[PDB]
Point group: D2
Chain length 408, copies 4
């Protein structure tokens, strides 16, 4: 086990090293504790839900998934949020996606109040017989369109209800699979069908204090490779023109595309972002978030340009090849330590150096900061917030495996 | 030498092949007539211009030389087209800088365009100048640099309005800035707020859409400016939609594997119009001559299938000084035209019906068969009907122009 | 329906057009006849096979007779003489078999069918969809019991391939593809590739006559659930093929974004024996779309034709599309490959080479662009008709008839 | 200025943190000492050389200036390293061309290397010359051009052999050719057969391996040569293995998303050795200064984990003239060293055992935790132990060198 004295000793030296270059480590940690991550429930049960890799101990019930999310949050320092999918409804009533009621989410409101977290929401527009040739809201079939418009409206009603009960705004994220496997003839009509359907879904006004909608594009998915109706361009344009949030998932863009570039091109025009951190490995593979170039650039671009107050950070990944609870903790800690490293830069001075075109100083300093003692500040943050330091939280995972997961 | 009676015979056979699948070749050729390509002047003289005086022989050095070279290229491109100018192609014996240009400095090109029977489009020149400070112009943090380039931007609109009034054809005034960073920036926000404010100042003075409208061209990366581009595609799509201006899509300026033909149908539920710059990137923004490849085929079929040509200006953008510079224009223009024509020769209404009814088998079979239908016989007919050489034959014209003009310079 | 005399007339015109630029259309069609495509059996039944019991289209093959019938139908619409690729799991026997107990006689069904059909056979060992796939690893597993099982399958694939080649009197290319790799970032990249090297050497050790069979080795950049590391890389297998005097398999879907596999041929053939070129359309990943006439296919085919590599390159199809008529999928991909080969053959290649050696890049650009709108379709139509296959749209009639007669009824038919 | 006591206090805590997970920080630093980086001379003078006479002040213009600049950079990079020369950095009062260079023309650099205490690597110069014809050299279809560049190739080996004999350290002699086509070629075979025959002629005359060995460097594409590269990565890996020579991997010269760290373990079952050129591509072969990024982290940890450093020569390759050219070297060298050191500070024996047991949970958790272990405290200790400044402090040295030397030029 890491000795708390060691953490304290390493921190006092780190505090001094950072002070010498005009950085306040105490202030950086206070900033980090204001950034909640929206932890996605569906990693816990391989997005099975309750309505309808192979590591042991998958959650099978609401109680099991709630316990698994409690365990993960207990190993993530600070206070965070949980994302639900519509299919995580908890009810003994026969429901379909077009007959869900707000009170079907009472279980999760009760849990969130006990846990002390806000909730965000996702409509479930997939894994259903009413998905016709990979299309839902923007299907050429009006029966199919009408079904999914009913689900869209219900997702807003559920979100409003949760937000009213919790006293925290529910971000209601819309993702559709809609597109073509092979090359389409008509690219225009599907996107005009989507525009009309979305305008219908958001028509009935709901209190902004309770919920606001975000819209998530994708470049391509398995079996839908050639055309995505809801493109990044379509949804940025839609978000700006309908005054809604735009969702950027770090896994859903071109090879070499840097999603951290988008923020400063959006915010002159738009309201807010839902930034979904996810690791693509050569496709939309939904690998666990790790400290890599993409995460470092996402977190430092939000910190440096002061966009955190208008940017919701959510996790999105599946990994069933590893301990599903560990997966949440790896991804959240990676995101947090990347935010903290960005906060531990002399940003005001670096901005002035850059304004004066001192590219020599900018390169030298940004490179030196990558080997400054940011880990000592992160360890101090973990310890101050009653979470295990470094390798130590593996003990907690092993105990949870023995006591809970391996007994299922 | 192709025999005209052979071209006519092969056309009548192709007309019948296409009629049998519900395609009217006569109508397709009338549709192609209505698509003018904006031919870029700067391929003729390696963007030297006249304002501030590969290695194939016969580069244009004077206005008369460049005007003659563009006349020769247009004589080998069937139908009616347009020419793009850069501000540095001003023709004047007065001492000018980019911030002191006057509309009359372009009288030479208005007179030439009237003679040639073509419209003109325009480009402000925001590069190759001492007032480019650390690769930044309009959105420089230096207010002296900003104010210089804002004066040029305002003057570009004044010139474009004047040309548009004189020609009675709308001048599309394309804005491209190099502005960005070689290496990783700290502040991505402030440069884009500087750009927003400066662009708003440039477009402030009211001018009639009838004479000119501005288009805004983004870039992912350029040589020596690799890490950050102030004017991103997202920034300019947002700006064009917000300010009711045109958005410029250059086929060479996007990510590896990015299909710019995807953008049109995501723009037109929101925006006014496009300036589509066809250009061949080879693994970077290399500005190769446009050829009939996946990208050009997808750009052209996406515009005709979805009926966007009436709101899309098509311009050429490439440099190739390793080949006959006049030939480069004709290859690019003909590649674009035959690609448009192939898209127009599809049974688009029936294919749309089959796709709406989820018959993806028929869509795949038919779209593949159409690639080996006799579209060439229709293209040859279009060339001959518009008094241009067929197939290989226009190399004779290039060789003669080399002998008579280019090789004597 | 096209009129045969219309096709013949359009051909005579195209023949004259090409003759005027020094191209012999008669000779081009004779060259195309000499390129057999190895049509993959597994598109017919979504790689189910018969050993262990995206797309939805009716009429999936469920039995050897049904698959054989489906391949016969597809081949009847593909002009000329071709080959069929088998997978080990397409063994036909009443005897209870595993991948390490298959016998050459288990492929007598396919030998008899190939002889009747007038096609050669290529072979693929099946190193996937099996309980003995341990953490996505087979031949190069760190578990010696798993390694040994898959080495037994590897040796059996060669014995089967040798037997088939002897019976058919046509060399069987025996293609090796392994899924082996990691989902996430590995610590040790060296040891898995040393385990692979040793296991492959053990599989090929016992000599078999080259006239009957030779092995080819297929690399991959990444697969679903195995994204971060592939034990059998393209570099590993090109090195292995050259050093062990075996063929190298290039699958057009298995490389980096923007990677042009047509670049590889001329860097391989100064050193290596032969290629198995697997034409496949990737759409943003290894999606195994039906082959279409696109930049990649045009470049693969013209690079093989221009540089005279067809005599040392076996061309196979590899794609999976169950969202469309599975029989039509074969015909689209086969015809796209053939018409792309034929367009390449209809170029004045000797003169274009001379112009290029003289650095006449102007003539090269103009002529290569003009050739894309020469009447290559009229030569393709003539080739289709001469080889008793339908012209252009006409083969959709044959597919609709096969749907009525076979595919739309098949699910309700008793399996036997 | 960082206090040595701060470095020592942080190191003692880090040493304990690492000891607790079975990692020996003292041993890791001894391992880093055995990895010399081959610092490229041509960053110092923007590849001008002396043979054929960004815009940051103080460019080196003479041998003494460039030698001084390399001494300054090496004085700020901890440990012992090497310097790479290009043929155009010949130092002589004699009239030379690339085909008349003599080994004694490098006596200047042998003497400098001995007094500096470094080994030398070598590069033939196959660019920026009238005898580069249509971007081709050794593999030109013109036998006059081929023969000129074959003579330079043979001379590069004679020079490398002579330097190796004098220094008693093997000179790695790296071959890079620009040879290729701007646009799509008809014949891909014949250029590569011309290259094969020409390279074989260059290496024909036996020279002692104790003095020199050749390495062969491929490229995917270069500016003005985008469509085809005669010397491909496949060609040269095949050539190196076949002719028992070294293969050069430049991290900037591959496809988008290509991970060159994948190549090592596919090469070493077959080949003799590598020359790894660390370089940062930004969307093309842009030759940015090496920084601590995914590519550098993967390159360094792949060499360390699989024990390939003793068969892999690590060289720098970048040119950035927009910043202090001496600082560029130090940023790139320190980035490479701290990335090697982080990889050396992992419990690799135990992680390999975990991975063999398919414990992917433990592998993910530990590899992520190690990214925020105190590797900087070990790096700082390495800097201090080897008499170089810690962290930001070496900017003081650069500012002093600017004042005293560079800005006086
Ligand atoms: C969310 C829901 O709200 C009311 O119906 C009650 O307080 C109930 O107990 C609670 O679960
Ligand atoms: C070579 C070719 O063979 C068939 O296609 C026909 O007989 C045709 O007339 C002839 O040109
Ligand atoms: C599960 C589903 O996956 C989609 O690709 C997308 O990332 C959505 O946000 C998520 O709800
Ligand atoms: C010459 C200049 O080049 C730029 O890259 C861009 O394409 C502009 O549109 C053009 O005006
Ligand atoms: C079905 C299997 O798929 C692999 O990805 C590869 O393409 C192999 O060649 C094939 O046998
Ligand atoms: C001995 C003979 O060698 C060939 O190169 C090839 O590898 C054959 O398969 C093998 O049987
Ligand atoms: C300067 C030259 O640049 C090339 O692109 C390559 O990287 C060579 O190694 C180097 O010698
Ligand atoms: Mn998402
Ligand atoms: Mn995803
Ligand atoms: Mn452009
Ligand atoms: Mn361009
Ligand atoms: Mn394959
Ligand atoms: Mn594939
Ligand atoms: Mn290099
Ligand atoms: Mn480089």
């Amino acid at each position: 086990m890491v000795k708390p004295e060691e953490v304290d000793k390493a921190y006092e030296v780190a505090k001094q090293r950072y002070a010498e270059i005009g950085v306040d480590t105490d202030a950086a940690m206070k900033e980090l504790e204001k950034v909640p991550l929206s932890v996605h429930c569906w990693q816990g049960d391989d997005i099975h839900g309750f309505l309808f890799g192979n590591y042991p101990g998958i959650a099978r019930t609401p109680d099991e998934l709630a316990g698994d999310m409690h365990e993960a949050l207990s190993l993530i320092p600070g206070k965070h949020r949980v994302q639900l999918h519509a299919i995580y409804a908890v009810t003994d009533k026969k429901r379909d996606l077009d007959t869900l009621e707000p009170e079907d989410f009472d279980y999760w409101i009760d849990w969130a109040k006990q846990e002390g977290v806000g909730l965000d929401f996702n409509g479930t527009f997939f894994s259903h017989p009413m998905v016709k040739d990979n299309m839902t809201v923007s299907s050429p079939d009006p029966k199919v369109r009408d079904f999914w418009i009913r689900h869209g409206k219900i997702s807003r009603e559920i979100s409003n209800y949760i937000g009213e009960k919790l006293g925290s705004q529910v971000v209601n994220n819309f993702w559709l699979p809609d597109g073509f496997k092979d090359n389409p003839i008509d690219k225009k009509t599907p996107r005009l069908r989507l525009l009309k359907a979305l305008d219908e879904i958001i028509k009935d006004p709901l209190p902004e204090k309770n919920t606001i909608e975000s819209f998530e594009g994708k470049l391509f998915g398995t079996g839908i490779e050639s055309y995505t109706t809801g493109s990044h361009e379509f949804y940025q344009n839609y978000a700006i023109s309908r005054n809604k949030l735009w969702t950027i998932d770090a896994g859903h863009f071109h090879p070499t595309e840097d999603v951290s570039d988008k923020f400063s091109a959006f915010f002159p025009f738009g309201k807010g972002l839902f930034m979904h951190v996810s690791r693509p490995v050569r496709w939309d593979s939904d690998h666990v978030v790790i400290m890599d170039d993409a995460l470092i650039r996402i977190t430092r671009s939000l910190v440096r340009d002061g966009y955190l107050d208008r940017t919701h950070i959510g996790l999105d990944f599946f990994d069933a090849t590893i301990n599903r609870v560990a997966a949440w903790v790896v991804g959240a800690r990676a995101t947090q330590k990347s935010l903290l490293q960005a906060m531990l830069a002399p940003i005001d001075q670096l901005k002035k150096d850059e304004l004066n075109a001192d590219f020599t100083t900018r390169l030298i300093e940004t490179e030196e900061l990558k080997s400054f003692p940011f880990g000592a500040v992160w360890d101090k943050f973990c310890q101050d917030h009653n979470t295990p330091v470094g390798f130590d939280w593996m003990n907690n995972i092993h105990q949870y495996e023995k006591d809970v997961q391996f007994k299922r």
